[PDB]
Amino acid sequence: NAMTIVQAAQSRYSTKAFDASRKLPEEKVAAVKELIRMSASSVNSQPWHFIVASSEEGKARIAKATQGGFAFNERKILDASHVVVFCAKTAIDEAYLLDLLESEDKDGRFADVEAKNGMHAGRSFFVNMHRFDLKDAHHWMEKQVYLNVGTLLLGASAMEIDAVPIEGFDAKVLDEEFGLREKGFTSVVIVPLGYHSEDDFNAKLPKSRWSAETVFTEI
Amino acid sequence: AMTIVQAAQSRYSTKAFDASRKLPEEKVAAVKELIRMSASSVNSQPWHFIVASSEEGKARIAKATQGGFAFNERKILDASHVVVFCAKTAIDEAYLLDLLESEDKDGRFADVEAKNGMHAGRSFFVNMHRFDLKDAHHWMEKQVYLNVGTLLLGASAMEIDAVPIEGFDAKVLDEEFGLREKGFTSVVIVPLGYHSEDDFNAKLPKSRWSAETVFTEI
Ligand SMILES: Cc1cc2nc3c(=O)[nH]c(=O)nc-3n(C[C@H](O)[C@H](O)[C@H](O)COP(=O)(O)O)c2cc1C
Numbered sequence: 001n002a003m004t005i006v007q008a009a010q011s012r013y014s015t016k017a018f019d020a021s022r023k024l025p026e027e028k029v030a031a032v033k034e035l036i037r038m039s040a041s042s043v044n045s046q047p048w049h050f051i052v053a054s055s056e057e058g059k060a061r062i063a064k065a066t067q068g069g070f071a072f073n074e075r076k077i078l079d080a081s082h083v084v085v086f087c088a089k090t091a092i093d094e095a096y097l098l099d100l101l102e103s104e105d106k107d108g109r110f111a112d113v114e115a116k117n118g119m120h121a122g123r124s125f126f127v128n129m130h131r132f133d134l135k136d137a138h139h140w141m142e143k144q145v146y147l148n149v150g151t152l153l154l155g156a157s158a159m160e161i162d163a164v165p166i167e168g169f170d171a172k173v174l175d176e177e178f179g180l181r182e183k184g185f186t187s188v189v190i191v192p193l194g195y196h197s198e199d200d201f202n203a204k205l206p207k208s209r210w211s212a213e214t215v216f217t218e219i
Numbered sequence: 220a221m222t223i224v225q226a227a228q229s230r231y232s233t234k235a236f237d238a239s240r241k242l243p244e245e246k247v248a249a250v251k252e253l254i255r256m257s258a259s260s261v262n263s264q265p266w267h268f269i270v271a272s273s274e275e276g277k278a279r280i281a282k283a284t285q286g287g288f289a290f291n292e293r294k295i296l297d298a299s300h301v302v303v304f305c306a307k308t309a310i311d312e313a314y315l316l317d318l319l320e321s322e323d324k325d326g327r328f329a330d331v332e333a334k335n336g337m338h339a340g341r342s343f344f345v346n347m348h349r350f351d352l353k354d355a356h357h358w359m360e361k362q363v364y365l366n367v368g369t370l371l372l373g374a375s376a377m378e379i380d381a382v383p384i385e386g387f388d389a390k391v392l393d394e395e396f397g398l399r400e401k402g403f404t405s406v407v408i409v410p411l412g413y414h415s416e417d418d419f420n421a422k423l424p425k426s427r428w429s430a431e432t433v434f435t436e437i
C-alpha cells in the first residue's frame with residue numbers, strides 16, 4: 001500500500017557492492033521478468049529486448065563492457081546474482097507495427113476488424129511523427145525502455161531485491177559481444193540485481209534529492 | 220513480489236476517471252515522495268513536476284489536449300491528481316554545482332575529496348552528453364521517463380488507476396505555465412485517480428510480446 005511503496009522508494013539505493021554468495025530465488029527472478037515484460041510503453045510499442053545473465057560466464061561477457069574508465073562498474077556486474085541488460089530497438093518499420101498489431105489481435109484487444117485498423121492508424125501516426133517529423137524515433141524508443149527500467153528499480157525494491165541502474169559501460173563493446181546491432185537492438189542500461197554486501201559504503205549514506213518545494217508546482 | 224507482479228498485471232491505461240473520487244491525502248503525499256525519490260543518472264534529477272488537483276489546474280493542462288489530442292481531455296479533467304512530468308531544456312555548470320551543494324547539505328560527502336570526486340564524475344557524464352554525444356536533452360528526458368515508470372508501478376501498488384500520456388501539445392502546455400523561459404519542457408502527463416464504470420479499456424486484456432521473444436537468458 002502507501003506505507004510499503006514510499007518505504008520501497010526511500011529504502012532502495014544504488015548498490016555499489018553485491019554479496020557474491022547470495023542468489024535470487026526463481027520466484028523473484030520470474031517476478032522480475034514478468035514485471036519488465038508487462039511494462040507500459042507508448043502505443044504499446046514495447047521497443048525492447050532484455051538479456052538476463054545468471055551464470056558466471058554470462059556476467060563475464062557483460063563485464064567486458066565495463067573496463068578501463070568504466071572498471072568502477074565491473075564488480076557490480078560480476079558479483080550480482082542476475083544482470084539485466086535493457087536493450088532498445090534501433091529502428092522501427094511497418095513490418096514491426098503489423099507483428100505488434102497481430103499479437104494484440106490474438107490477445108483479444110479488438111472487437112471488430114475496424115477497431116484493429118483504428119489502433120494501427122493511431123499507432124502509425126505517433127510512430128511516423130517520431131520517425132520523420134521529430135526525427136527522434138530511436139531516442140523515443142529508448143525513452144520507453146527507460147520507463148521500463150524505472151518499473152524494475154521500484155519493483156525490485158518492493159521485493160527486497162538490491163539493484164543499481166548503470167549507464168557507465170561501453171555500449172559498442174556490449175553490442176558487439178551479443179551481436180545486438182545486427183539484430184536491430186542496442187544496449188542502453190545494465191541493471192545488476194542481488195543482495196548488497198554489508199561492506200557496501202553507499203548503503204549507509206543518506207539519500208539526497210531536491211526538496212519538495214524545489215521540484216513541485218501544485219495547482 | 221506476488222503483489223508487485225499483480226500490480227504490473229492489473230494496472231492499465233485508464234480512458235475515463237470518476238470526477239467524484241479523489242485520492243486520500245496519504246496516497247498523494249506518497250505519490251509526491253515516490254517521484255521525488257526516483258533515481259536518475261548521476262543523481263541529475265533533471266525534472267520538475269506539476270501536480271494539478273483543482274478544476275482550474277486541470278483545465279489549464281487540458282488546453283494542451285485539444286483538436287487531434289481531444290481524446291485525452293476527459294482523462295485530464297476527470298482524474299483526482301494530474302502529474303505533468305517536465306524535463307530540463309539544458310544543463311550547465313551552475314546546475315551541477317547546485318546539485319553538488321544539495322548533496323553536501325544532505326551529508327553525502329565525508330570530506331572535500333569525496334565532494335570533488337562526485338563533481339568530477341558527474342561533470343564527465345554531463346559534458347559527454349552535452350558536447351560529445353550532443354544528446355543532452357534526450358538524455359535528460361530518459362531520466363524523466365525512468366521516473367514515470369516508477370509512478371506507473373507505484374500507483375498500481377497503491378491500487379490507483381494511472382494513464383501515461385504523450386498525446387498533448389507540449390508547446391501549448393509549456394506556454395501555459397511559462398516553462399521554457401524557466402528552463403523546463405513538458406514530456407509526459409500522468410493523470411491519477413479511480414476509473415469510472417464506463418471504461419472500455421478496463422475490461423480488455425493486456426497484450427505484450429511473449430517471454431521467448433523479449434528474453435535472452437545466459
Ligand atoms: C540511468 C541511470 C544510470 C546510472 N548509471 C550508473 C553507473 O554507471 N554507475 C553507478 O555507480 N551508478 C549509476 N546510477 C546510479 C545513480 O548515481 C543513482 O541512481 C543516483 O545517485 C540516485 O541515488 P540512488 O540510486 O541511490 O537513489 C545510474 C542511475 C540511473 C538512473
Ligand SMILES: Cc1cc2nc3c(=O)[nH]c(=O)nc-3n(C[C@H](O)[C@H](O)[C@H](O)COP(=O)(O)O)c2cc1C
Nearest residue numbers: 040041042043044230231232291383384385386425
Ligand atoms: C510514454 C507513454 C505515453 C502514452 N501516451 C498515451 C496517450 O497520449 N494516449 C493514450 O490513449 N494512451 C497513451 N499511453 C498508453 C499506452 O497505449 C499503453 O501504455 C500501452 O498501450 C500498454 O497498455 P497499458 O498501459 O494499458 O498496460 C502512453 C503510454 C506511455 C508509456
